[PDB]
């Protein structure tokens, strides 16, 4: 009953495209490294996020891993 403060989220993102099939191939690349990929359809485009945690340190390690993995991952704090 009411626990853990909610304020912002640290998730990693390697890209977004108007095509879901493209957002699926991307999410697949991240999966290879072993990241939790996700495709969210926004009013016009599809986003590909990989690795979501409560601590930014997590997103950073993921992101950099994506870069080293061959993907342009970035960390963003969404509230």
UniProtKB/Swiss-Prot annotation:
Domain SPOR, first and last residues per copy: 4-78
Subcellular location per the Swiss-Prot or TrEMBL entry: Secreted, Cell wall
Region (2 X 35 AA approximate tandem repeats): 8-79
The organism's place on the tree of life at top rank: Bacteria
Domain notes per entry: Contains an N-terminal catalytic domain and two C-terminal tandem repeat sequences that play an important role in peptidoglycan binding.
Family, per entry: Belongs to the N-acetylmuramoyl-L-alanine amidase 3 family.
Role according to the record: Autolysins are involved in some important biological processes such as cell separation, cell-wall turnover, competence for genetic transformation, formation of the flagella - in particular of its basal body - and sporulation. CwlC is able to hydrolyze type A cell walls such as B.subtilis. Its main function is to lyze the mother cell wall peptidoglycan, playing a role during sporulation.
Protein's name according to its UniProt entry: Sporulation-specific N-acetylmuramoyl-L-alanine amidase
Organism expressing this protein natively: Bacillus subtilis (strain 168)
Taxonomic lineage from the root: Bacteria, Bacillati, Bacillota, Bacilli, Bacillales
Gene (name only): cwlC
Shown chain mapped onto the complete sequence: 177 to 255 of 255
């Amino acid at each position: 009953l009411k626990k853990t403060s909610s304020s912002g989220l640290y998730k990693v993102q390697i890209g977004a495209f108007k095509v879901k099939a493209n957002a699926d191939s991307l999410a697949s690349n991240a999966e290879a490294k072993g990241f939790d990929s996700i495709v969210l359809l926004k009013d016009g485009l599809y986003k590909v996020q990989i690795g979501a945690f409560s601590s930014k340190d997590n997103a950073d390690t993921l992101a950099a891993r994506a870069k080293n993995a061959g993907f342009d991952a970035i960390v963003i704090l969404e509230s």
